[PDB]
Amino acid sequence: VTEFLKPRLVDIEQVSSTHAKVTLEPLERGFGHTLGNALRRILLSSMPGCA
């Protein structure tokens, strides 16, 4: 009952340079949005750095 479809990055089609395109499958009928939204909101601000 706690067994889901554990996913994986099937490919990293890094298009050209300083640009990647990472596809992850398979997730549940609803987990693509929650992982996309979690990673999108964290990368946007939380991720530190210098400028």
Added chain:
Amino acid sequence: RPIGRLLVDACYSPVERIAYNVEAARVEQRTDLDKLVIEMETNGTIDPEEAIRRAATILAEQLEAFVDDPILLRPVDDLELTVRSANCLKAEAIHYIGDLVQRTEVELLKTPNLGKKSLTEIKDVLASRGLSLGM
């Protein structure tokens, strides 16, 4: 299976309404901190701390994924291997390039009449065709 059973639909779902309300934090002297207050709505079958614990376990299990060809159908003889390497592979019933590519380097070293030199030859030839051992 008999005619006397009756099948109802199955809504295996204990919760009804989950509402979070973020708000400012003042307990810590440090400002720009937040409090997450989640009002759930259970039907009594699930403890709330058990619900938030299973939800965090499911999400951290989901982030475990990234946290800390017509050539295969060809016979092995078409690889231009040394007469020794080809005869050693045939002795292990490896007939096709697709069979060879599935074997690991550690498995090929167990085969009879298979030296370190013949293993290097097989790798160099597979690499020339864009193939690697252990696919």
Added chain:
Amino acid sequence: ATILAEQLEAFVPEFDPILLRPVDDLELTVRSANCLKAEAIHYIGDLVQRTEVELLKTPNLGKKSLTEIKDVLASRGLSLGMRLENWPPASIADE
């Protein structure tokens, strides 16, 4: 993913019990159950000790009822003619 995972680490002697059961629990035909009761076979552990040749001597036990008993015992991983040392356990000798 490392940041989001670090933000969640504060959350995350009778033969057997089956031998002690009555023969009626084997879902046998009313004929097979009544034939076994007539020979004072009450428990599954008593039935498992009897040989196929002994069960065929029981009055009114047919070849069909013997096949039913074998198929049912086989469904539970039991066979006719197993010797249980120390059967019946002293817990059953007082009923």
Added chain:
Amino acid sequence: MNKEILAVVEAVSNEKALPREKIFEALESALATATKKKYEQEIDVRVQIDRKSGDFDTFRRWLVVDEVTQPTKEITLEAARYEDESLNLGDYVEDQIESVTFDRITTQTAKQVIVQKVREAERAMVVDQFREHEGEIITGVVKKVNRDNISLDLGNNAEAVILREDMLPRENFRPGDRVRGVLYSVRPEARGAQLFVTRSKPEMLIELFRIEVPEIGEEVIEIKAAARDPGSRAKIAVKTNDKRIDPVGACVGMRGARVQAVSTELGGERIDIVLWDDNPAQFVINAMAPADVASIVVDEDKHTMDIAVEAGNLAQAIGRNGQNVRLASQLSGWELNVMTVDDLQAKHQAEAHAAIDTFTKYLDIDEDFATVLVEEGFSTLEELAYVPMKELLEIEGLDEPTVEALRERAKNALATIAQAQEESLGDNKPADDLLNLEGVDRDLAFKLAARGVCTLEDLAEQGIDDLADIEGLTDEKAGALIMAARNICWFG
């Protein structure tokens, strides 16, 4: 209906020369299988066909067994004997069951089982009657050409296969072409081709000569050996017991007509026909044709022959890519070394000098006495150690005391060489390194070291094929020892 069963049994019995009983047993099995498929449960079923009416009764069969594993198809002997006391282990208990209506489904199943029974009866008896063809040159029509094999139709639903290795290198067959070949193997496999046909092996040459040369079919001329490079060149060795018949002339025929017919069937393969001799040296001279042999030296211990030829004939004696010497060696069974008369003399002088050096070094004799031993035919320390004392006493200037001393020195030299081999590996190298490999006894370590495998690294570098000739070492035991050696040397 009734009389129709008898008419079908009679028609099939007469047309396929098959026992009526075998057809009925198979129809019973077919109907039992068709019945089993109509039930949702796995049942056992026996069908019995009445041999006079063609009527059939179907049972729920219950294989009488001692221990019941399948209660749906098996019954205990005690339970079977409750119904009929005459039943034994392996008999069937029946149960009144409705016989399957003979629809076109059962009809199709019955037809398939009859066809399969005919393959195992009519076609099997046809193959038995064609015992000659199973071995001689069968003729087939090419049904299908694949990359790796050719499927031939022989008629009567018999299919044969020619494998890629069994074809001549320049043959191109099309569907509908007629092909001859020798049936060299019949395999009773449950799937695949059962009949294997060759055009490349030597048997194809032998049987073509049997058909083209009546004197071979009449057993007047015997083919003793055949060596073949398929689609390029062959050699055959022929003998006759009739002194009035030239066996080579008979196989060649008038102006070569017979040998040219065989050559044409083999795609223009060149065939040399040689006289078989009971003397190996004379037979090898004949096998080397068309090259003239100047001298032969025979080494019986190595099973080798050195063939001297004139310098002008060397290229002909070897042939294109060594084809002539290889075919002669395969035909004689001897390893054949082809060299010039000058090279043979230089080889013999080098061997004589090496024997003289060996005898001078190990026997503590002068070069003059070592030369006499080599001139009398002694080349090894083993010959001097083990040869009968009478042969050594026939040498001019040897007395019984000197022969005894020479033999004692030869035995002591062999023992010193054997001990120096055992010390080079087996007292230090193969007594610690090669011995470490779990399973190596001291005898096996010395056998390995006699092949130059002195260390555990040398053993890790071997193949199973390099060790296969060591007495007491099986391929499995060789493989285990090489893997143990590799685990220590490469993964320790």
